[PDB]
Design an enzyme around this catalytic site. Structure first.
Site, short mmCIF file in Angstrom:
data_model
loop_
_atom_site.label_atom_id
_atom_site.label_comp_id
_atom_site.label_asym_id
_atom_site.label_seq_id
_atom_site.Cartn_x
_atom_site.Cartn_y
_atom_site.Cartn_z
N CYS A 106 45.31 54.18 43.60
CA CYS A 106 44.27 53.20 43.72
C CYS A 106 43.40 53.19 42.49
CB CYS A 106 43.34 53.51 44.95
SG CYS A 106 42.03 52.26 45.10
N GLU A 283 47.03 41.31 41.00
CA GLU A 283 47.75 41.44 42.27
C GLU A 283 48.23 40.06 42.75
OE1 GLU A 283 46.11 44.48 45.20
OE2 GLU A 283 44.20 44.19 44.04
#
Ligand code: HEM
Ligand code: HEM
Ligand SMILES: Cc1cc(N)nc(C[C@@H]2CNC[C@@H]2NCCNCCc2cccc(F)c2)c1
Ligand SMILES: Cc1cc(N)nc(C[C@@H]2CNC[C@@H]2NCCNCCc2cccc(F)c2)c1
Ligand SMILES: C[C@H](O)[C@H](O)[C@H]1CNc2nc(N)[nH]c(=O)c2N1
Ligand SMILES: C[C@H](O)[C@H](O)[C@H]1CNc2nc(N)[nH]c(=O)c2N1
Ligand SMILES: [Zn+2]
Lengths: 407, 411
Positions: A106, A283
């Protein structure tokens, strides 16, 4: 035993001591690195509990105090007679925040301590789950000003009474196979979409149909629920320079909310623990829109730009890629929906690593995932050596429940 | 054991059995992955096993395993080791060996080409002048007026580690770096240290932005000597952009021949500390790393300035835009001048085909994803979606410390 990581752009060298507190296995050996592979009882529970409570009491600077000792005793008593135990609210909040803190994949962990934890351990039905999830969605979305959250359903017991959210994310678009032979909507979600229809969903058969939730409570067969459409914030995608872009018909949702993972705290397993933050632009613009197995729009976009698609060496794919990503960031910003670009996110992550190194002795990080899927080496994480190792509390991948559940 | 790798774009699953032949270690443990760490005098005792292992591979590749000629050679090497403590490779074995080190280089995306290496045996070389001559010939041959051919030149192997052949340049052709009193750098910041040594060795530095460094060559453990490559042998490409006419006025050029000269080649336990090799560039090496790294020429700002991109916010992606344009320019300039170069789309695609073939014929293909994935546009290349297994096979190319750090100066 003591390990150094070097940044090759800045020459800064950090010493990692945190890896010695590492527990789970990486999948690598001395003979072989699996760094790029996506997936590489009462006697078991008490050491896990102790390990966890020890780090908790240490973090509140009450290690070896009478409240520490007392709590270790209580938990052990409960494990002995009940065969599990319940976390205190304080421990659950700490566990959740640390599972994010330890998520080596992350990039967004600079935020790890700001997480809003919603304790849904009193939930008993799929209906209860749906309520909690809508409340999660609305709190996190915050009319575009996103706030990180997690909602935690009851823990695994005998593993025959699992709470699961069958969706991989709270909000995703449907995918449909067509007689035409191609795919309409999101090809990632084709199988789930059919499971929805097979459970009784009326699919509108469009390109961007927000999937219904399939919630399983207490191990029962899952049930379908539509999120209120007014809770699902979506962004139409336009380009600040290209008028024609809007006519591609593209949209994405504002709330990334991962719902298929398993949160492990103190040896306890939370199989339904949807969490959410906000998107890094790549993303959507790189992966969701341009992956071959996804919406795969590169061909169409390059065409609207009138680029030379005769030879790969014109870098037409690359030119179009940038523009797609410019449009994502622009659209989100214009609509005041939190988004972060990959420059800004990776820079914040280097700052976070350095904080974690000085403050905690390390930061587990998976370079393969941390480096953005475009413009790798012009972001600072590319030049940053990282050590990857598994700490608990943690989030873990878990298999799609339809392979597991019996009806 | 069978290990599986998946391509997440195609769902193609491959099975690696070759990692079983791997002996050297990775840096990784069951507890830590060092996948992104850049860097994670022999006995008779250890040497014959390494020889034996190598000669078994060699004789297998030629369909002669267990033949009289195979056993003869094992015995002859055994004897040579006990007698002289080392051994000499036959030309056939050297060639095979050097081709295999390349084949086994897990960080190299260019390996589809591995079987076409031109091998130059420079094991009769004795002096730095001798080394300079071998290197000029390599440059000229590899360059081939722009139609680049892959080649390697192999100098005498290590003996006691006190008589090493070394090329001190990290590449045969690289540009000088000069640190200025105001803290700015002129030319390539990556080469400041090496440039200062060349100067201290008596190189007269032109002090411009693209001065080709002299060769600093060490023979037989002696102090290194300086040599200027004939300029007519150093092919360069002025960089221009197909649509942007102001791009030429940035004054950029690059050399056509990438030729790594600081690595160590291990074959059958023998160590070749000077083994320059060369192929041709993938565009991004120049357009992404050399031009756009912050610690390299760092031209992103100046390019985006001339493009009049909005630079007040990173979220305009001004850097990403400028980067694509620069990379277009590099490929355009090379193609226009008929100098071999390969774009990252075509290179990675060929690599996937290479890799699948290696799995079919060889049982695996060790590959370092961190390095194989290009430094721009990662996931629009097929390798991003390809799971890879990294492990160490010999023959191999290994990193070695820079010689100025270890050299005993004779004077
Ligand atoms: C606040 C903004 C956040 C940003 C910008 C962010 C960014 C990212 C990115 C870019 C990835 C790679 C995901 C992919 O490519 O599929 C990722 C993975 C991940 N994130 Fe974060 N994240 C954020 C919030 C959170 C929160 C709130 C949590 C937990 C509470 C979390 C836990 C994880 C985990 C466990 C992964 C790996 C997931 C997997 O293996 O699929 N993230 N994140
Ligand atoms: C023929 C065209 C070739 C291409 C396009 C190619 C491409 C590349 C690239 C892009 C890298 C990583 C570059 C970097 O970032 O430093 C690399 C690394 C490497 N290549 Fe190749 N290569 C080629 C030929 C060769 C040859 C002929 C050899 C040796 C015979 C070789 C051996 C290696 C080795 C040992 C590495 C790792 C270098 C290191 O660790 O610094 N390559 N190659
Ligand atoms: C097979 C498998 C294993 C694994 N660990 N994972 C997956 C999900 C894939 C991975 N990569 C794309 C997709 N995951 C979908 C996007 N994930 C968003 C992560 C994120 C971003 C911002 C804020 C957040 F809270 C969370 C699949
Ligand atoms: C410290 C350290 C360790 C290591 N293994 N390596 C290095 C050289 C780095 C790798 N990345 C930038 C720099 N060296 C760049 C030179 N790489 C050219 C590879 C190549 C390309 C085409 C044809 C060929 F024959 C060879 C440094
Ligand atoms: C095979 C490879 O590990 C796979 O494509 C990875 C690479 N890096 C990634 N990085 C992120 N952030 N997300 C991903 O889904 C992937 N996929
Ligand atoms: C820290 C990291 O491993 C380092 O910056 C690597 C990343 N990947 C790379 N990949 C290539 N091809 N060349 C490099 O120099 C690097 N540098
Ligand atoms: Zn590893």
């Amino acid at each position: 035993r003591f390990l150094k990581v070097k940044n090759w752009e800045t020459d800064v060298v950090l010493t990692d001591t945190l890896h010695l507190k590492s527990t789970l296995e990486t999948g690598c050996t001395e003979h072989i690195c699996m760094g790029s592979i996506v997936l590489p009882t009462k006697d078991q529970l008490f050491p896990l509990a102790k390990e966890f409570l020890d780090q908790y009491y240490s973090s509140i600077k009450r290690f070896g105090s009478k409240a520490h000792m007392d709590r270790l005793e209580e938990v052990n008593k409960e494990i002995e007679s009940t065969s599990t135990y319940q976390l205190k609210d304080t421990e659950l909040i700490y566990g959740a925040k640390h599972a994010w803190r330890n998520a080596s994949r992350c990039v967004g962990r600079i935020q790890w301590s700001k997480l809003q934890v919603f304790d849904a351990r009193d939930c008993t039905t799929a209906h209860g789950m749906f309520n909690y999830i809508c409340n999660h969605v609305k709190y996190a979305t915050n009319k575009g000003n996103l706030r990180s959250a997690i909602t935690i359903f009851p823990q695994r017991t005998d593993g025959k009474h699992d709470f699961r959210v069958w969706n991989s994310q709270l909000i995703r678009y449907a995918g449909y196979k067509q007689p035409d032979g191609s795919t309409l909507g999101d090809p990632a979600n084709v199988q789930f979409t059919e499971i929805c229809i097979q459970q009784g969903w009326k699919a509108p058969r469009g390109r961007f149909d927000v999937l219904p939730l399939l919630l399983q409570a207490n191990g029962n067969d899952p049930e379908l629920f539509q999120i209120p459409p007014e809770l699902v914030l979506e962004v139409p995608i336009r380009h600040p320079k290209f008028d024609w872009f809007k006519d591609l018909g593209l949209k994405w949702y504002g709330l990334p909310a991962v719902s298929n993972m398993l949160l492990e705290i103190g040896g306890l397993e939370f199989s339904a623990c949807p969490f959410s933050g906000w998107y890094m632009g790549t993303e959507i613009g790189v992966r969701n829109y341009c992956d071959n197995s996804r919406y795969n729009i590169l061909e169409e976009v390059a065409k609207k730009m009138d680029l030379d698609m005769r030879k790969t060496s014109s870098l037409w794919k690359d030119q179009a890629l940038v523009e797609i990503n410019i449009a994502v960031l622009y659209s989100f910003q214009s609509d005041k929906v939190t988004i972060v670009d990959h420059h800004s996110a990776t820079e914040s992550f280097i700052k976070h690593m350095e904080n974690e190194y000085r403050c905690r002795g390390g930061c587990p990080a998976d370079w393969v995932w941390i480096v953005p899927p475009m413009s790798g080496s012009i972001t600072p994480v590319f030049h940053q050596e990282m050590l990857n190792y598994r700490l608990t509390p943690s989030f873990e991948y878990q298999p799609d429940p339809w392979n597991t559940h019996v009806w």
